[PDB]
């Protein structure tokens, strides 16, 4: 309500949102994509691609 200059340097400008970033996520999906055992009545074992996790 009162203005003054409500932006001061820090923690006068931090009672608002203050840069909501990298919220905790289910990008890798448990209980759906994993924790999954609905795997189809396939034919053979074709391949399982191995990737060196550089990143």
């Amino acid at each position: 309500m009162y203005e003054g200059n409500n932006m001061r340097s820090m923690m006068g400008t931090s009672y608002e949102d203050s840069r909501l970033n990298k919220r905790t996520e289910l990008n890798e999906n448990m209980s759906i994509d994993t924790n999954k055992s609905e795997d189809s009545y396939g034919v053979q074992i074709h391949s399982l691609s191995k990737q060196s996790f550089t990143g």
């Binding site: 391949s47 399982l48 691609s49 191995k50 060196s52």
Partner: protein, 51 residues
């Protein structure tokens, strides 16, 4: 009773063989003797007892 015995066919029965693991084919340059890698140990969060 005098002819040389007449041979007519050889074949060389031959088949190739497989791997069943060739989707693990990782090539390299063959340098260095030892190779290793690592992982981080977990650090569980904490109670902010700000006193």
């Amino acid at each position: 009773k005098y002819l040389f015995p007449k041979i007519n066919e050889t074949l060389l029965i031959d088949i190739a063989l497989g791997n069943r693991f060739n989707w693990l084919a990782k090539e390299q340059d063959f340098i260095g003797q030892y190779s290793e890698e690592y992982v981080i140990m977990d650090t569980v969060p904490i109670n902010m007892d700000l006193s």
